[PDB]
Design a protein around this motif. Structure first.
Motif, short mmCIF file in Angstrom:
data_model
loop_
_atom_site.label_atom_id
_atom_site.label_comp_id
_atom_site.label_asym_id
_atom_site.label_seq_id
_atom_site.Cartn_x
_atom_site.Cartn_y
_atom_site.Cartn_z
N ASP A 65 -13.88 19.21 4.78
CA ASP A 65 -14.68 18.29 4.48
C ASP A 65 -14.30 17.18 3.50
O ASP A 65 -14.55 15.84 3.60
N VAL A 66 -13.29 17.46 2.72
CA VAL A 66 -12.66 16.48 1.74
C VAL A 66 -11.61 15.84 2.65
O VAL A 66 -11.55 14.36 2.34
N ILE A 67 -10.96 16.39 3.57
CA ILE A 67 -10.21 15.66 4.55
C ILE A 67 -10.93 14.97 5.54
O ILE A 67 -10.38 13.93 6.25
N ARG A 68 -12.02 15.32 5.92
CA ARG A 68 -12.80 14.64 6.83
C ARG A 68 -13.56 13.22 6.06
O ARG A 68 -13.80 12.35 6.86
N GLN A 69 -13.54 13.18 4.73
CA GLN A 69 -14.24 12.22 4.02
C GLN A 69 -13.66 10.73 4.30
O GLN A 69 -14.67 9.87 4.44
N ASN A 70 -12.42 10.58 4.71
CA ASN A 70 -11.92 9.32 5.03
C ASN A 70 -11.97 9.44 6.59
O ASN A 70 -11.48 10.26 7.34
N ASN A 71 -12.04 8.10 6.99
CA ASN A 71 -12.38 8.03 8.38
C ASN A 71 -11.04 7.35 9.15
O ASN A 71 -10.14 7.49 8.74
N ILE A 72 -11.30 6.89 10.35
CA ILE A 72 -10.30 6.53 11.27
C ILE A 72 -9.77 5.09 10.69
O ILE A 72 -8.56 4.82 10.13
N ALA A 73 -10.53 4.23 10.30
CA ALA A 73 -10.35 2.80 9.56
C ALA A 73 -10.14 2.96 8.24
O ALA A 73 -9.74 1.86 7.70
N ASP A 74 -10.83 3.89 7.55
CA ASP A 74 -10.31 3.85 6.08
C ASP A 74 -8.95 4.02 5.85
O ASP A 74 -8.10 3.57 5.03
N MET A 75 -8.29 5.03 6.68
CA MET A 75 -6.80 5.17 7.03
C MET A 75 -6.23 3.85 7.37
O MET A 75 -5.10 3.36 6.70
N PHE A 76 -6.78 3.21 8.21
CA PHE A 76 -6.21 1.73 8.74
C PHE A 76 -6.30 0.59 7.67
O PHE A 76 -5.35 -0.16 7.35
N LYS A 77 -7.52 0.92 6.66
CA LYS A 77 -7.63 0.17 5.70
C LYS A 77 -6.58 0.31 4.55
O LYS A 77 -6.23 -0.49 3.93
N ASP A 78 -6.02 1.62 4.56
CA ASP A 78 -5.12 1.69 3.50
C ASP A 78 -3.62 1.38 3.88
O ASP A 78 -2.87 1.18 3.02
N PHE A 79 -3.42 1.20 5.30
CA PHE A 79 -2.13 0.79 5.70
C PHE A 79 -1.73 -0.72 5.33
O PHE A 79 -0.61 -1.08 5.10
N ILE A 80 -3.03 -1.34 5.48
CA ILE A 80 -2.66 -2.90 4.77
C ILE A 80 -2.62 -2.62 3.31
O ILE A 80 -3.52 -1.95 2.86
N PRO A 81 -1.63 -3.29 2.60
CA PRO A 81 -1.65 -2.95 1.14
C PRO A 81 -2.38 -3.95 0.49
O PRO A 81 -2.18 -4.42 -0.91
N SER A 82 -3.49 -4.71 0.91
CA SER A 82 -4.47 -5.26 0.27
C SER A 82 -5.06 -4.58 -0.80
O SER A 82 -5.09 -3.50 -0.90
N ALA A 83 -5.36 -5.62 -1.71
CA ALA A 83 -5.64 -5.37 -3.09
C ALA A 83 -4.26 -5.61 -4.00
O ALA A 83 -4.21 -5.28 -5.16
#
Lengths: 49, 53
Positions: free
Chosen positions: A31-49
């Motif tokens: 469930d820890v690895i479950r906790q981030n989604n498909i697009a949370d991962m895609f949110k991380d790939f953009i270096p935004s912030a």
């Protein structure tokens, strides 16, 4: 022979009940690895912030 | 000739001794066991496809 096999039910009812928690400990750690989604991962790939 | 009265009482005794109130509970144990795997594999397929992209 009746008492032979009900004395073999008791390990198998316990060994099944042992693995019930050891299954769910993996589930809690999944469930820890479950906790981030498909697009949370895609949110991380953009270096935004 | 086997008696007709005990031949009814033979079958009527068989209809009381039956696992049907047990095996249905046993099969609904396994279905609720296997539903927990299916409800877990949906989490897997929604994770690996997330990883695969």
């Amino acid at each position: 022979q009746k008492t032979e096999l009900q004395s073999d039910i008791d390990p198998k009812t316990e060994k099944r009940n042992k693995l019930d928690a050891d299954r769910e400990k993996i589930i809690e750690s999944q469930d820890v690895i479950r906790q981030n989604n498909i697009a949370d991962m895609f949110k991380d790939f953009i270096p935004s912030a | 000739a086997q008696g007709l009265q005990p031949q009814i009482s033979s079958k009527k005794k068989l209809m009381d001794d039956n696992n049907l109130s047990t095996t249905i509970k046993d099969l609904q144990s396994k279905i609720d066991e296997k539903n927990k795997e299916i409800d877990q594999f949906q989490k897997d397929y929604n994770k690996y496809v997330g990883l695969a992209f």
